[PDB]
Structure formats: structure tokens, C-alpha cells
């Protein structure tokens, strides 16, 4: 499971006729970096079968 | 469950072929991001 917890916001700023840049607005919420969890039990079983092969 | 957690940084500018061509700016995504993936394989050396 992979999550980016930061609640970012998109700011559309017009930089010419038609062109529009999507800037990152101020953060809403926590100051946490994205991460991924993997069940240690299942990963230990899988790693065991890996080292067997 | 005791699931291991891995830290991930994020890039919006990537160059997998800047020399062949051009770079890409991944637009920012509003809100929190969460995807569930099957990890089926590995690549080792």
C-alpha cells in the first residue's frame, strides 16, 4: 500500500494565451512523506521461498 | 501484521530520455494519494 499523505493543492496560473502552469499550493494537513507498507509475515514467507529457489 | 514501511520521495521532473527527446513535468495531484499494488516480482543483481 503506497500513500502520499500530503494534501496538496493545484494552482492554475495563466502564463500566456492558452498556456497554464499547475503550481503546488500550500500544504493542507500533515508534514509526512509518502511511504508504502508491506505485510512482514507475507514478505517473510515470500523471501523464504525466494532464498529456497 | 507488523508490516514493514518504506519511505518514498516524489519527483515531478524526470528524465528517462531527456537526451533522446525531452523532459516531463508531472503535474501536481490535488489531495492525498493512495494506491494498492500487487508486488509479483523482483529484479536483483
Amino acid at each position, epitope marked *: 500500500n503506497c*500513500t502520499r499523505p500530503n*494534501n496538496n493543492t493545484r494552482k492554475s496560473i495563466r502564463i500566456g494565451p492558452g498556456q497554464a502552469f499547475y503550481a503546488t499550493g500550500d500544504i*493542507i*494537513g500533515d*508534514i*509526512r512523506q509518502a511511504h508504502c507498507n508491506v505485510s512482514k509475515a507475507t514478505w517473510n514467507e515470500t523471501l523464504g521461498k525466494v532464498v529456497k529457489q | 501484521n507488523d508490516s514493514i514501511t518504506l519511505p518514498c520521495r516524489i519527483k515531478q521532473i524526470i528524465n528517462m530520455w531527456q537526451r533522446i527527446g525531452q523532459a516531463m513535468y508531472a503535474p501536481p495531484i490535488q489531495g492525498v*494519494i493512495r494506491c494498492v499494488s500487487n508486488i509479483t516480482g523482483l529484479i536483483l543483481t
Partner: antibody
Amino acid sequence: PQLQESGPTLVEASETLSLTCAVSGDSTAACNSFWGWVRQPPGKGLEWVGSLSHCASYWNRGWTYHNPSLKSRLTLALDTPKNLVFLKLNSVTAADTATYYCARFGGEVLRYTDWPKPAWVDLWGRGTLVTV
Amino acid sequence: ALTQPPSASGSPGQSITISCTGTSNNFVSWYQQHAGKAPKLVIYDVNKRPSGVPDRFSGSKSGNTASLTVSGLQTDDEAVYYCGSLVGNWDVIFGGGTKLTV
């Protein structure tokens, strides 16, 4: 920013007490503050009732915090476009007779860790007297 | 829980100090409520004042005891002062209230 309470000032025993706060000058959708209530019995101290906010995270559609004792008998509600707060108290007793204040909670609401932390009440209301 | 003295009267001009015991965190705040009226935030984040609140009011903390200090009491300062803090996971508690009389 002005909070105007409205609702029945006189409710009969064993019935459902309903009160509504009307916000003016700020948006209830705004994630900068939490919205809730604080009751002051005629003389006693301030007791926290509860507060909520629709600004959620990836696993929920919002946050709602209740004071442990009143949780079973209370219901909190927010109308975001009309900037209105709702409060419903079931099975009211003479212990619930109080001056109810509409409260805006400041704190680590805009940048929190693990969970939002509403702490100080920056904006209060005029409050209404509810007699059971 | 949060505890406060029942009263803490003082003559105008004197420097006065009120205390609040039972704080486990820095989510301490102070509100002022006149008789028959509504409370007003006067202190947040232990020591911060909202814009427009006079600078005679200051907040400090020693150990588990927070303190509010007023230098130069005025006749319009008479009111009931309440303290508030965050406890447990997300719960909020207040003190009993202190009646400051001039």
C-alpha cells in the same frame, strides 16, 4: 465573522433538543479551524461538547470528536454552503440546562501530525440559554 | 483536569498573576468572559495574543503550571477567566474559571 444561534429556547423533557449556529464572514468548508460547541451551566465552568470538520484524510470523509460522556446522546452536523452548524442533544435532563456557545477551534488544524489538534477557541458566539 | 483558584482580586495598577495547573501539553489557552456576555480569546499557543489584545497580558509556563501576567490593572479587566488544554488523544478540558474583581 459572526455566529448567530437560533432554535427552540424551551424544550420539553425526554424530547430532542436542536440548536443551529449561523456563520457569517468565514466558510465552514475552510480547513483552518474546527467547528463545535461549548456549554456553560449558569455559573459553573466551561465544558467541552464536541467539534467536527469535513476536511478529511485518505481513510475518512471527515473528523468528528465527541466528549466521552455525551457521545451517546449527541449529534454534530455541518452545512458547508450555508455556513451553518447543527447540534442535536437527545434525552435532555435538568443537568443540561445551560448557556450554549457556538465555538470556532484554533490550533494545529492546518498543519497537524497524525491527527488534527483543535485547541484554542479563537472565535466565540453569543450563546443561548436552554432550559429543560 | 484543569484547576484554577476561585478568585484573584487586585487593586488597579498592581501587577497580577494567575496560574493554571494540570497542563500536559502546549495546547494551553486563556479566554476572558465578562458577566452575562460571551468569552473572548486573549491567549493561545501558551503565550500568543490575538491582534488587538493589549500587550499588558503575557503568558508563561513553568513545569506543569501555566501563568498569565497583567501589568497595570484596569477597571474594565473585571471578568471571569477560563483556561483550556488538550488532553488524551483529542479531548479538550477547561478549568473551573476564576472571577477577577477590581
